[PDB]
Amino acid sequence: KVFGRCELAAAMKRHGLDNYRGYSLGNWVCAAKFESNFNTQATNRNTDGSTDYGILQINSRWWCNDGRTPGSRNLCNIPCSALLSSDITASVNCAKKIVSDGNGMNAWVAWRNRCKGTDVQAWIRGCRL
Ligand SMILES: [Cl-]
Ligand SMILES: [Cl-]
Ligand SMILES: [Cl-]
Numbered sequence: 161k162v163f164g165r166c167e168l169a170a171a172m173k174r175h176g177l178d179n180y181r182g183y184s185l186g187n188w189v190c191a192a193k194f195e196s197n198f199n200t201q202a203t204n205r206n207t208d209g210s211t212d213y214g215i216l217q218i219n220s221r222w223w224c225n226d227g228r229t230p231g232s233r234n235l236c237n238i239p240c241s242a243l244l245s246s247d248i249t250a251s252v253n254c255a256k257k258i259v260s261d262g263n264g265m266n267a268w269v270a271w272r273n274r275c276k277g278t279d280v281q282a283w284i285r286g287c288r289l
Contacts, residue, residue: 161246163198163215165189166287168248173289175252181259185289186280188255191271192216193283200251201244214243214251216268223254 196202236254
């Protein structure tokens with residue numbers, strides 16, 4: 161599913177992501193924009209052989225099981241395929257664990273490089289929330 165911008169903001173809020181660990185909704189929408197362009201089915205293969213999955217490009221090295229990332233963990237206790245669903249529940253619940261892991265949203269390199277320090281509220285501007 162490719163979400164609309166406000167549609168995704170609303171779904172993220174529904175699932176308790178808004179201001180989670182102090183990160184406003186615009187941060188999460190911005191991260192999703194640059195990680196996946198709002199596409200739940202996004203996948204990307206990393207140089208180390210791990211894969212990033214879903215709207216927030218969650219990585220199989222630590223967070224989910226895909227059966228093909230040697231030496232990896234599955235800390236969200238989910239198959240990586242669950243992160244590709246039209247229902248963002250699994251991605252949100254896993255993101256909550258990731259952002260609580262110590263480095264906040266810096267876990268998402270694209271958030272650090274493209275969202276951090278910017279006017280992230282622009283991502284939810286106009287949205288009925
Ligand atoms: Cl915001
Ligand atoms: Cl594996
Ligand atoms: Cl980047």
